[PDB]
Design an enzyme around this catalytic site. Structure first.
Site, PDB file in Angstrom:
ATOM      1  N   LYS A   7      23.027 -52.959 -68.189  1.00  0.00           N
ATOM      2  CA  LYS A   7      21.649 -52.558 -67.932  1.00  0.00           C
ATOM      3  C   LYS A   7      20.720 -53.151 -68.992  1.00  0.00           C
ATOM      4  O   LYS A   7      19.606 -53.571 -68.679  1.00  0.00           O
ATOM      5  CB  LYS A   7      21.524 -51.032 -67.906  1.00  0.00           C
ATOM      6  CG  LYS A   7      20.138 -50.539 -67.552  1.00  0.00           C
ATOM      7  CD  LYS A   7      20.082 -49.030 -67.440  1.00  0.00           C
ATOM      8  CE  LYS A   7      18.676 -48.572 -67.113  1.00  0.00           C
ATOM      9  NZ  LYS A   7      18.547 -47.091 -67.066  1.00  0.00           N
ATOM     10  N   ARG A  10      20.136 -56.786 -68.180  1.00  0.00           N
ATOM     11  CA  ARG A  10      19.225 -56.947 -67.048  1.00  0.00           C
ATOM     12  C   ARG A  10      17.783 -56.648 -67.436  1.00  0.00           C
ATOM     13  O   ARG A  10      16.871 -57.391 -67.083  1.00  0.00           O
ATOM     14  CB  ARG A  10      19.635 -56.044 -65.874  1.00  0.00           C
ATOM     15  CG  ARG A  10      18.615 -56.021 -64.728  1.00  0.00           C
ATOM     16  CD  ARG A  10      19.099 -55.211 -63.524  1.00  0.00           C
ATOM     17  NE  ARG A  10      19.373 -53.808 -63.841  1.00  0.00           N
ATOM     18  CZ  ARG A  10      18.461 -52.839 -63.869  1.00  0.00           C
ATOM     19  NH1 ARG A  10      17.188 -53.100 -63.604  1.00  0.00           N
ATOM     20  NH2 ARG A  10      18.826 -51.594 -64.146  1.00  0.00           N
ATOM     21  N   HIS A  12      16.469 -56.455 -70.669  1.00  0.00           N
ATOM     22  CA  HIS A  12      15.937 -57.108 -71.866  1.00  0.00           C
ATOM     23  C   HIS A  12      16.350 -58.519 -72.258  1.00  0.00           C
ATOM     24  O   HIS A  12      15.784 -59.076 -73.195  1.00  0.00           O
ATOM     25  CB  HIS A  12      16.172 -56.181 -73.062  1.00  0.00           C
ATOM     26  CG  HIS A  12      15.654 -54.793 -72.851  1.00  0.00           C
ATOM     27  ND1 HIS A  12      14.308 -54.502 -72.805  1.00  0.00           N
ATOM     28  CD2 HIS A  12      16.301 -53.621 -72.651  1.00  0.00           C
ATOM     29  CE1 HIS A  12      14.148 -53.209 -72.585  1.00  0.00           C
ATOM     30  NE2 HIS A  12      15.342 -52.652 -72.487  1.00  0.00           N
ATOM     31  N   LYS A  38       7.311 -49.860 -64.259  1.00  0.00           N
ATOM     32  CA  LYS A  38       7.707 -49.537 -65.630  1.00  0.00           C
ATOM     33  C   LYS A  38       6.542 -49.953 -66.523  1.00  0.00           C
ATOM     34  O   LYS A  38       6.172 -51.124 -66.561  1.00  0.00           O
ATOM     35  CB  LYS A  38       8.986 -50.281 -66.024  1.00  0.00           C
ATOM     36  CG  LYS A  38       9.532 -49.876 -67.383  1.00  0.00           C
ATOM     37  CD  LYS A  38      10.849 -50.572 -67.702  1.00  0.00           C
ATOM     38  CE  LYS A  38      11.396 -50.101 -69.041  1.00  0.00           C
ATOM     39  NZ  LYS A  38      12.686 -50.752 -69.401  1.00  0.00           N
ATOM     40  N   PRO A  39       5.925 -48.983 -67.220  1.00  0.00           N
ATOM     41  CA  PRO A  39       4.783 -49.173 -68.122  1.00  0.00           C
ATOM     42  C   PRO A  39       4.880 -50.365 -69.072  1.00  0.00           C
ATOM     43  O   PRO A  39       4.006 -51.236 -69.076  1.00  0.00           O
ATOM     44  CB  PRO A  39       4.737 -47.850 -68.883  1.00  0.00           C
ATOM     45  CG  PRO A  39       5.190 -46.875 -67.862  1.00  0.00           C
ATOM     46  CD  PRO A  39       6.374 -47.579 -67.247  1.00  0.00           C
ATOM     47  N   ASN A  41       7.845 -53.172 -71.196  1.00  0.00           N
ATOM     48  CA  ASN A  41       9.199 -53.713 -71.296  1.00  0.00           C
ATOM     49  C   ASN A  41       9.191 -54.992 -72.127  1.00  0.00           C
ATOM     50  O   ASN A  41       8.196 -55.715 -72.154  1.00  0.00           O
ATOM     51  CB  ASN A  41       9.771 -53.991 -69.904  1.00  0.00           C
ATOM     52  CG  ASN A  41      11.248 -54.323 -69.935  1.00  0.00           C
ATOM     53  OD1 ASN A  41      12.086 -53.450 -70.163  1.00  0.00           O
ATOM     54  ND2 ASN A  41      11.579 -55.586 -69.683  1.00  0.00           N
ATOM     55  N   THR A  42      10.301 -55.262 -72.810  1.00  0.00           N
ATOM     56  CA  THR A  42      10.413 -56.449 -73.650  1.00  0.00           C
ATOM     57  C   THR A  42      11.625 -57.296 -73.278  1.00  0.00           C
ATOM     58  O   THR A  42      12.717 -56.772 -73.052  1.00  0.00           O
ATOM     59  CB  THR A  42      10.520 -56.067 -75.150  1.00  0.00           C
ATOM     60  OG1 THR A  42       9.338 -55.364 -75.554  1.00  0.00           O
ATOM     61  CG2 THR A  42      10.680 -57.313 -76.019  1.00  0.00           C
ATOM     62  N   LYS A  63      13.792 -44.439 -82.974  1.00  0.00           N
ATOM     63  CA  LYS A  63      12.581 -43.665 -82.720  1.00  0.00           C
ATOM     64  C   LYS A  63      12.895 -42.235 -82.286  1.00  0.00           C
ATOM     65  O   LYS A  63      12.115 -41.320 -82.552  1.00  0.00           O
ATOM     66  CB  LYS A  63      11.723 -44.352 -81.658  1.00  0.00           C
ATOM     67  CG  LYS A  63      10.939 -45.534 -82.186  1.00  0.00           C
ATOM     68  CD  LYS A  63      10.159 -46.220 -81.088  1.00  0.00           C
ATOM     69  CE  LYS A  63       9.287 -47.332 -81.660  1.00  0.00           C
ATOM     70  NZ  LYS A  63       8.617 -48.118 -80.582  1.00  0.00           N
ATOM     71  N   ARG A  82       3.164 -55.560 -70.546  1.00  0.00           N
ATOM     72  CA  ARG A  82       2.396 -54.322 -70.529  1.00  0.00           C
ATOM     73  C   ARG A  82       1.604 -54.236 -69.232  1.00  0.00           C
ATOM     74  O   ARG A  82       0.887 -55.170 -68.867  1.00  0.00           O
ATOM     75  CB  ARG A  82       1.440 -54.272 -71.723  1.00  0.00           C
ATOM     76  CG  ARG A  82       0.766 -52.925 -71.926  1.00  0.00           C
ATOM     77  CD  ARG A  82      -0.301 -53.004 -73.005  1.00  0.00           C
ATOM     78  NE  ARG A  82      -1.420 -53.851 -72.600  1.00  0.00           N
ATOM     79  CZ  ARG A  82      -2.482 -53.423 -71.924  1.00  0.00           C
ATOM     80  NH1 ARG A  82      -2.586 -52.147 -71.571  1.00  0.00           N
ATOM     81  NH2 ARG A  82      -3.443 -54.275 -71.591  1.00  0.00           N
ATOM     82  N   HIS A 116      20.048 -50.182 -75.738  1.00  0.00           N
ATOM     83  CA  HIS A 116      18.651 -49.764 -75.640  1.00  0.00           C
ATOM     84  C   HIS A 116      17.777 -50.622 -76.556  1.00  0.00           C
ATOM     85  O   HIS A 116      18.198 -50.987 -77.652  1.00  0.00           O
ATOM     86  CB  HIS A 116      18.545 -48.281 -76.025  1.00  0.00           C
ATOM     87  CG  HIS A 116      17.151 -47.810 -76.302  1.00  0.00           C
ATOM     88  ND1 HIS A 116      16.228 -47.577 -75.305  1.00  0.00           N
ATOM     89  CD2 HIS A 116      16.530 -47.508 -77.468  1.00  0.00           C
ATOM     90  CE1 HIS A 116      15.099 -47.151 -75.844  1.00  0.00           C
ATOM     91  NE2 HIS A 116      15.256 -47.100 -77.155  1.00  0.00           N
ATOM     92  N   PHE A 117      16.585 -50.981 -76.087  1.00  0.00           N
ATOM     93  CA  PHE A 117      15.656 -51.789 -76.890  1.00  0.00           C
ATOM     94  C   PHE A 117      14.701 -50.753 -77.466  1.00  0.00           C
ATOM     95  O   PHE A 117      13.950 -50.113 -76.730  1.00  0.00           O
ATOM     96  CB  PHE A 117      14.896 -52.817 -76.046  1.00  0.00           C
ATOM     97  CG  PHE A 117      14.084 -53.780 -76.870  1.00  0.00           C
ATOM     98  CD1 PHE A 117      14.632 -54.992 -77.278  1.00  0.00           C
ATOM     99  CD2 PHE A 117      12.784 -53.461 -77.266  1.00  0.00           C
ATOM    100  CE1 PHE A 117      13.900 -55.877 -78.072  1.00  0.00           C
ATOM    101  CE2 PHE A 117      12.044 -54.341 -78.061  1.00  0.00           C
ATOM    102  CZ  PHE A 117      12.610 -55.551 -78.462  1.00  0.00           C
ATOM    103  N   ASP A 118      14.732 -50.585 -78.783  1.00  0.00           N
ATOM    104  CA  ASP A 118      13.919 -49.561 -79.416  1.00  0.00           C
ATOM    105  C   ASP A 118      12.521 -49.962 -79.852  1.00  0.00           C
ATOM    106  O   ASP A 118      11.579 -49.184 -79.699  1.00  0.00           O
ATOM    107  CB  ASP A 118      14.676 -48.952 -80.599  1.00  0.00           C
ATOM    108  CG  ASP A 118      14.279 -47.517 -80.861  1.00  0.00           C
ATOM    109  OD1 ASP A 118      14.267 -46.718 -79.896  1.00  0.00           O
ATOM    110  OD2 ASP A 118      13.995 -47.186 -82.027  1.00  0.00           O
TER     111      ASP A 118
END
Length: 121
Positions: A7, A10, A12, A38-39, A41-42, A63, A82, A116-118
């Site tokens: 995931k 896919r 990031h 999705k608000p 994403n990077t 975070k 964004r 996870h991308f923090d």
């Protein structure tokens, strides 16, 4: 039905590219606009090996307060997506912004990989 590591890849990873329509295309093609837009994403434009390597780099607090986050020693090529105000589902619109920053990812499992991308700093 996808693993956490899969995931992350896919959502990031985009090693292929090193445009202004990028995020509009990518957010859609990576299925990040199926249930909603999705608000933010990077995407990271570095090799998978280089990103997986971040899991053995600088340990920093996540975070969410967990301790399994790692910051890259070197800056990485990334693209921030964004959502705009004019963007209304199912026609999600995004602003594509390129940048070179250090990334922070959360790692888990055996093998210990990014899940996870923090943040980017």
């Amino acid at each position: 039905k996808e693993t956490a590591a899969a995931k992350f890849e896919r959502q990031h990873m985009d090693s292929s590219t090193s445009s202004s329509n990028y995020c509009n295309q990518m957010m859609k093609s990576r299925n990040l606009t199926k249930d909603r837009c999705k608000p933010v994403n990077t995407f990271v434009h570095e090799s998978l090996a280089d990103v997986q390597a971040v899991c053995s780099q600088k340990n920093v607090a996540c975070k969410n307060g967990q301790t399994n986050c790692y910051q890259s020693y070197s800056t990485m090529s990334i693209t921030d997506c964004r959502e705009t105000g004019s963007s209304k589902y199912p026609n999600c619109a995004y602003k594509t912004t390129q940048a070179n920053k250090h990334i922070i990812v959360a790692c888990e499992g055996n093998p210990y990989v990014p899940v996870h991308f923090d943040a980017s700093v």
